[PDB]
Symmetry: C3
């Protein structure tokens, strides 16, 4: 079943919103299949955010993301990539839709609560980057026969 | 005052989301005016979903909806039909707006939490189908003078 | 930092939704910087809503808003004016986006829970109208270094 990578960023951690964001993920039907609290080493940040190297926000991004722990996650569900993006909300939390994670919890574009893979793929690439698969559990859940036909 | 028919489907029942969905209905201002937990007999499913007889999802629909109890409801408020649809969200929960019932709780189009009448109507027709009106209470509520001019 | 004026109207007060609406404001990142429960004197209503004098809903507006206490607020954050409007939702709560204050809590256009300044601005003008600034506190909060770059 489709997987995506999600990351609760240091702003949500330092604002004590870990449970709230995880709740929004869970109640949507998405299955948490890997998850760990970790400090992000420099080299991981830079490879994760490689595609942003030329951009004005890059240095700030790398600093922010290495500034306190993140909660890294693998999340599984039909259409998981696009589902996650929909509940996370657009990149600028001031335009992110009310009811989305960024739309309800975030203020500014550079401190926007959570990251999700933007496609199949960068998902996966990001999953392989952050997780070895002995870290990724596989389990059936009671609700599954009720989420899906 | 306008009424509509709403139904909490077996997916929300089996996922233990009855109270959550009812809460979203109540806090919007809509008045619960009839409500019962019931197993849906075959013949009721088929007449309820009559308009879908030719369609690829039909057999799955009928099976799903008869597979565990539903919470059937009559709900009253100005513009109740269109209000309910707005908070329920579009049919595919992956596109349903965040903050909507389907947008927050549902994953797939065939397991989308709740049904609402799509017009004045089919409301109603559906109300008469599911409820005799000795089943439908009529009562004024303290908030009413505050919801409405 | 940008400020806006917000007001919890007598419908939310009389529906006991004060905490809920304040929660939605707080968790977005907005800083409550002035706030008071007050009955709105006639002359204040009329100057507040001056721009609506010719309109069909005017007399109803003035009556409603003077009919029970309101919770008047000054709220501070980057882009506070437009942020507040986004989480409050469009004027008619039947079209206001699910997940917004009006979209989740309001039914009708004339009883729509809360008011927010519509621009820099009328903010602000409304702040000066409702608050003397000995009423407006200024304080740094622990989350601030996490909301903002
Ligand atoms: N300070 C600042 N940061 C920005 C700006 N634009 C983008 N960013 C940051 O970089 C991201 C840009 O969005 P995307 O193209 O989806 O890539 P990404 O969002 O960095 O990836 P994730 O944040 O991990 O989801 C935002 O999350 C912000 O954290 C900006 O104009 N100013
Ligand atoms: N499996 C599956 N089910 C579908 C599909 N399209 C529609 N459905 C089901 O049939 C419904 C179609 O939407 P509508 O035209 O509003 O009618 P309806 O939604 O069945 O009516 P309610 O579900 O009771 O609101 C959805 O609720 C789904 O339960 C599909 O492509 N696949
Ligand atoms: N009864 C009734 N009231 C309306 C109607 N249109 C607007 N209103 C009221 O007047 C407001 C009109 O919207 P705006 O142009 O943003 O100004 P405003 O909303 O009054 O300002 P705030 O309510 O304080 O945010 C609504 O909040 C309603 O309270 C209407 O057609 N009928
Ligand atoms: Mg992004
Ligand atoms: Mg439907
Ligand atoms: Mg308005």
């Amino acid at each position: 079943m489709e997987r995506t990578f999600l990351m609760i960023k240091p702003d949500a951690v330092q604002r004590n919103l870990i449970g709230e964001v995880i709740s929004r993920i869970e109640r949507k039907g998405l299955k948490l299949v890997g998850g760990k609290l970790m400090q992000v080493p420099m080299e991981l940040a830079e490879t994760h955010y490689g595609e942003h190297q030329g951009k004005p926000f890059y240095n700030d991004l790398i600093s922010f993301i290495t500034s306190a722990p993140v909660f890294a996650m693998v999340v599984e569900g039909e259409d998981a990539v696009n589902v996650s993006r929909h509940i996370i909300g657009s990149t600028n939390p001031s335009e992110a839709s009310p009811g989305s994670i960024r739309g309800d919890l975030g203020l500014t574009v550079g401190r926007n609560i959570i990251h999700g893979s933007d496609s199949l793929e960068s998902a996966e690439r990001e999953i392989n980057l952050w997780f070895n698969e002995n870290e990724i559990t596989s389990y059936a859940s009671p609700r599954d026969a009720w989420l899906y036909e």
